[PDB]
């Protein structure tokens, strides 16, 4: 539209979603490490 | 028991998808749909 | 060498569990 | 040449058109 | 329009259903599929 | 505010100038359906050939076809 | 040369051979 | 604010940034293609294209480089076996460097389209608000796609201008890149005929020109425009994703069942060749022929090329590996050194015993020897107790024809058992196991990994198609329902 | 108390035993039986 | 409207269906008792599983000749 | 009458009663 | 696979952890 | 396809659990339940019959 | 439509006839859903009652034989047929319905018509959610059962030797298929399968615990000990105490839900992700890409008799399953394994 | 040192870059 970009958006990640992401990634590690090491 | 856990997944997806199907508009496409729900609010958040 | 990795991953998941229990965002009534 | 496999397949395509025509009859005859 | 009670109809159809299931459990001990 | 005037942009402007304009009613949807159903028949032909539920005289449908 | 000795030679090794899958009407 | 799974939606209504991200993704993909060609050339060993072929090395992108014509290398070798005298500019490393350069150019173009997103080209003049003429743009792209398909099918693969494609024999013996004439008949739909590829691409390209012209001229109808929501970029996203997993099923099934566009010399043998005894048929047929005219079983087994016996080995199946058995087949069972020879097992009294070959489903299979007529005669027994089929009392002796061991006969039960256990896996081989520190367990082919990746990606893209079509049909109720 | 036992449930008029899906389950069950606790057994019937 | 409360409690419904329900039951009985099920659905009769030729489970072992092979292997 | 409800309930009831008679018939088939 | 598995596991921990911690620190910095 | 009635209310054909079988100059009562097998355990077996689950229970003659 | 004239046509008349309140919503998708679903269900009920399995597998799978509910099945066709579509007009049957039934064509009928009935049902979910103007999360949820169905009954037999190795439609046949995946594939050890198990058991946990929490944190609205009569259809207040529920689970479990929308999205998310992971794992198994072995533990157990683990016990049990089930389950291989060579422990 | 050196270099690239990206994204979020 103008010289600046009109679609300027902010991203959000609450501490709860941080906790789901960390559990998810670490659980994928616990699950899959035995198989990657094989 | 197998029917119980298969129906548990059935009805969990069913009820979650019906509640998520009938969510009421408070937010925009910018904000996640959960941001339309406020903790401790009196009004019901979906159309039963 | 592998038991080190498994032990680290397990205590990492437990640490994230501890932080999620006792260090959550406090819900507000409003 | 028209293999009998081809012949059965073409009559099956005819039959599918017949089923669609009957479905049209069901939707127009309420 | 309702000249036979709905509960009476339901009890009779339940009786036929139970008698049918009893026949099905009986026939597993005799004839085909009866391990004998 | 008008955007950035460009030589190649003004070149490709007419190809993307008439956005959102249509023909009334149905148009060529019947001929589209003929295209759909002929494609379905052709695609089912080659599916049955590779599944060999349809036999043709010249089609070996096996590795000896590479001979 | 003959198609019967090949059939009897490949019967003991693998039984899903395509020649055991074709033209065994009379077998 | 925006959730993490929604951030890329910032380029929905900005065509400049959309072209920028398409360009950047194109740069990443081309840079990967070049980087992987370089990695595979670095881990490639072309010293043995008969017993250490390229599909035994875990090479993924070099089969696709070779399938279209790139067979020469700047390294002084050609994978077909010859010595690269004049490879030219288009070697394996040549295509790799070209992909890296193209990725750099596309990164520069993505930077430019990120900065200069406000192009007046993206503005509809009638209202001044940004838009896309999606039917017309689709028509243009279909015109270009059809023209490119026709050019590739009439010029490259036919050999009038390009090099053709990789064509081999049915049994995968020699193999080379040659031009293939188009097949316009019913034979052109034979999926193993290489003549289908030029004829198909010519016809599909011509039809692409015709459909692109129709789409450049004819506008969509109003009620179809509102039914399919043709003015929305997410609708075309969903329809394209549908076409993409459709093509993913098609290429995955093509790779798995085998076709002329999946040659075994590049992608490995299929599961069904071992299941249906294809190479085994050829081996004992080339034995029966030329045994029928003298030169008995002591000889003419060396007439069997070492390629057919190598293709007749369960370790070359793509359905015999594991999901976490990572890497090359050589890293699994060792590098094949040489064919030890066809082992013929015989009883004490005169009957010949054949080893029951291993079916694909089994990871462990018991060792049995059966006669011609189909009666079990000997075995390597698990119990060995109150038993009368064991080797030490049946009296089985093993002989060799046409391999590393020629004419040798072994009667010691231990070596008889080990040769029977190896003949269980098909033709017996020596493997140098010390070169890659091979563990011993079987692997999957590039064909097998290709099918797995594309089928899993295909189901994930089926869900993506459903979700995106859902978003297009239900765009107005995304934040919730209308309350009234 | 165990699950249902449907082995040799169907027989023909001449008394031959037809295999059944329950009999395929029985075959897999035997494979699961004999291999489990391979050295712990000294006697045929596994009453213990 | 007939909300399923006056239609299953109606003698008009019950008289007409006192013949169709057990006529259907008798027809299903005769379909099994007269062997028409054996004939149309391909299931062999309890006394016709093994013939004089074979004494084991039949095997199809062919695809395009499967029709006449299962013809020759079945009980006619 | 002959409604959509009629046809949809008949398609699932008429073969059902026919089949129930069928199973009840074979339930007394001896060997 | 004993060192390659180790570096794969370390990568798969650190990289998504880095991504999510970008987003969380960004979010919490806005009060 | 031959049109014949089924078996109901007419008593059972065989109940004694045994079936006769005639071979090369020998007649015996085979187990009606046992399945025949084609594996010639010995090079001189005329008929071999074994139980459906286990091949432990097997009966065969030699000639 | 949209302030235009748009004179009516046969499409609009048919659309208005289809999209209206009836006893059963038919819709456009019902042109597919109703016949395909009726034929799949009726074909299964027909095969479980009359259609034999004596020629495709050498088994018994119909009520006319003597099988009950748990044991009857519509059996997959013979391995010889491979992945043939088993059309009744095709080469194997040649138009003849009777010998089509006994050659295994009914499995292909039930599978193809069941797939198209599933497509028709998801299109029905899309259509009904559009007509009532609701978000299509019910169809997004149903995406996972179709993913499981296609990966199990279509992708896996297409990857293996043929439809014979697909699950036959029937309870004991499904159990055979399950024990087959145990013995041949070690599907218990597969990370994608155990993700599916975690998803299904977690979805059952969420279902049970949301039900109990809601049913135990109600508001009064009473003057009656039957709580079920304290609910009215159209109002604007919460029926159970969200804050009390959050407090209870915060003090019992440590963490608790405080967003109703995220709670129900989690109840939606858990079974869908579980079933999708199971689908991906079955697609891996379609190409025999098993998580059968741990290379390090297997080489350690080969180089040490004293190393014994539950995983090695499972490997031995799987060898037992394969070798004791192959001869009777796979007639096409003609596997006449003698009693001699079968694996066997001491006694038993 | 051929794969240990690779994982050492990989972690040296990732951990300080990730820390710096945390801080920079945190800053640029707040204007
Ligand atoms: C050509 C394919 C394609 C394209 C162009 C898009 C594009 C889009 N999708 Mg979609 N999607 C696709 C396929 C595709 N999708 C598939 C296959 C699935 C099934 C898994 C989905 C499921 C899906 C969902 C559930 C959602 C979207 C959403 C969106 C929108 C925002 C995406 C976003 O911000 O996430 C950002 C992603 C990240 C921040 C990180 C993701 C990291 C991934 C998970 C792992 C790393 C992948 C790896 C590096 C690359 C290999 C992938 C490749 C081989 C396929 C966007 C327009 C969102 C939407 O609807 O908008 C409102 C949304 O809710 N998609
Ligand atoms: C269509 C995609 C595709 C396919 C089919 C293949 C196929 C193949 N690749 Mg390849 N690769 C790809 C993409 C692909 N690749 C990409 C995009 C890259 C760039 C990153 C690479 C980089 C690469 C390298 C460097 C190498 C290969 C190699 C190989 C060959 C060995 C088999 C294998 O991959 O190990 C097994 C595969 C797996 C175990 C994958 C696991 C299955 C899923 C994805 C589980 C992961 C999910 C889970 C969240 C992960 C958590 C684990 C964590 C705890 C560590 C094989 C033919 C090797 C080779 O042979 O050299 C020539 C080799 O060294 N590839
Ligand atoms: C002029 C540009 C150009 C050229 C000459 C090449 C050339 C080559 N590329 Mg390449 N590539 C390019 C651009 C180019 N690329 C770009 C821009 C990208 C980024 C997206 C890539 C990414 C890429 C990758 C990832 C790979 C290659 C590979 C290759 C090599 C083999 C191609 C192959 O075997 O696959 C065959 C190509 C196809 C099968 C294309 C199929 C087309 C489908 C069917 C389109 C159908 C949809 C369409 C709309 C249908 C229209 C309908 C019709 C009626 C009109 C070859 C040397 C491969 C390789 O071996 O590495 C070196 C490899 O894996 N390229
Ligand atoms: C929602 C309706 C529907 C759908 C989607 C299907 C779908 C299917 N059915 Mg089915 N069926 C239906 C209704 C339906 N059926 C009904 C109502 C009956 C009872 C009459 C049957 C009875 C039935 C049987 C007995 C069988 C199937 C089978 C099949 C499968 C393959 C059929 C096929 O490929 O033929 C192809 C059909 C078409 C391609 C239709 C398109 C016709 C084209 C567009 C027109 C061409 C014809 C035209 C006259 C050509 C001449 C024109 C000339 C003048 C130029 C398939 C998945 C087979 C199966 O189960 O597989 C094992 C099979 O055995 N069906
Ligand atoms: C064994 C498990 C299982 C069964 C039996 C099942 C069944 C059903 N779920 C449905 C719905 C759903 N499934 C859902 C989530 C889930 N469903 C799950 C697991 C199951 N879901 C799981 C695990 C989840 C969690 C993701 C959702 C979200 C929905 C719905 O919206 C819907 C509903 O409202 O539930 C009431 C219904 C759709 C049926 C229909 O008319 O389709 C029409 C198509 C038909 C009938 C043709 C299909 C025929 C099939 C494919 C082949 C034939 C099968 C034979 C008839 C029977 C074979 C039985 C043997 C194998 C033993 C049906 C009641
Ligand atoms: C020495 C050591 C440490 C030993 C341990 C070793 C060991 C055994 C390791 C294994 C552990 C490990 C992590 C393995 C599991 C791996 C595994 C299979 C992972 C699968 C991963 C994966 C991505 C799967 C995808 C499927 C998926 C989404 C699963 C998620 C499962 C999951 C989180 C389900 C929910 C479970 C659960 C407890 C929910 C309770 C929710 C809750 C409290 C609601 C209650 C509630 C209800 C209400 O109604 C209201 C109103 C309120 C308010 C309220 O609160
Ligand atoms: C009302 C509508 C029902 C829709 C049909 C579904 C069931 C049809 C088959 C039942 C049948 O005929 O069995 C028929 C069998 C017949 O019984 C058997 O018949 C043979 C005849 O030779 C032999 O005699 C056997 O020995 C004998 O047991 O009945 C049984 O097996 C007894 C139990 C049957 C009860 C069914 C319970 C199933 C419960 C729920 C259904 C599952 C899921 C529903 C939701 C999804
Ligand atoms: C962390 C995230 C990645 C986890 C996997 C790490 C593998 C470890 C490893 O050994 O890698 C290394 C392996 C090979 O590693 C080694 O290679 C050597 C030769 O170079 C030898 O052969 C060795 O035997 C081998 O172990 O190669 C890879 O890089 C794996 C590539 C991964 C892609 C495989 C296909 C995936 C297809 C689809 C994926 C998604 C599908 C949809 C969803 C499901
Ligand atoms: C600038 C420039 C330049 C340069 C360029 C370059 C150098 C480029 C490149 C590049 C590159 C070198 C690239 C690469 C890449 C890669 C990629 C892009 C990747 C990937 C991958 C993926 C995505 C994966 C994933 C996964 C995993 C992780 C595992 C398994 C599973 C999956 C598949 C998921 C030049 C001078 C020319 C010119 C000027 C400009
Ligand atoms: C073959 C075929 C077809 C189709 C057909 C159909 C689709 C039909 C049907 C059908 C059906 C549809 C059937 C049915 C049946 C049913 C039944 C048989 C039922 C049942 C139930 C029971 C028996 C039980 C009951 C009960 C009781 C009583 C108690 C409690 C409850 C319960 C429920 C459990 C045709 C010809 C087209 C052609 C092609 C092929
Ligand atoms: C649940 C239900 C129902 C129902 C059903 C049914 C069907 C029922 C029944 C029932 C019954 C079916 C009853 C009966 C009864 C009776 C009784 C309970 C009695 C008695 C008595 C006594 C105690 C006796 C005595 C004696 C002796 C001791 C000896 C001889 C003489 C005499 C006989 C006197 C319905 C559907 C409606 C609805 C829903 C729910
Ligand atoms: O631990 Mn496990 O498996 Ca119940 O049975 Mn007695 O214990 Mn022993 O044997 Mn059998
Ligand atoms: Cl155990
Ligand atoms: Cl004991
Ligand atoms: Fe609720
Ligand atoms: Na024992």
Short mmCIF file of N, CA and C and ligand atoms in Angstrom, two decimals, chain I residues 36-41, chain N residues 345-346, ligand 16:
data_model
loop_
_atom_site.label_atom_id
_atom_site.label_comp_id
_atom_site.label_asym_id
_atom_site.label_seq_id
_atom_site.Cartn_x
_atom_site.Cartn_y
_atom_site.Cartn_z
N UNK I 36 8.14 -68.71 24.62
CA UNK I 36 8.19 -67.99 25.88
C UNK I 36 8.64 -68.92 27.00
N UNK I 37 9.54 -68.42 27.86
CA UNK I 37 10.17 -69.21 28.92
C UNK I 37 10.68 -70.54 28.38
N UNK I 38 11.59 -70.43 27.42
CA UNK I 38 12.04 -71.61 26.70
C UNK I 38 12.76 -72.61 27.59
N UNK I 39 13.46 -72.17 28.62
CA UNK I 39 14.18 -73.10 29.48
C UNK I 39 13.47 -73.38 30.79
N UNK I 40 12.43 -72.62 31.13
CA UNK I 40 11.79 -72.73 32.43
C UNK I 40 10.88 -73.94 32.55
N UNK I 41 10.60 -74.63 31.44
CA UNK I 41 9.64 -75.72 31.42
C UNK I 41 10.36 -77.06 31.46
N UNK N 345 11.16 -74.50 22.52
CA UNK N 345 11.88 -74.49 23.78
C UNK N 345 11.91 -75.87 24.42
N UNK N 346 12.40 -75.89 25.65
CA UNK N 346 12.38 -77.12 26.43
C UNK N 346 10.97 -77.38 26.94
NA1 LIG P 16 10.10 -74.04 28.24
#
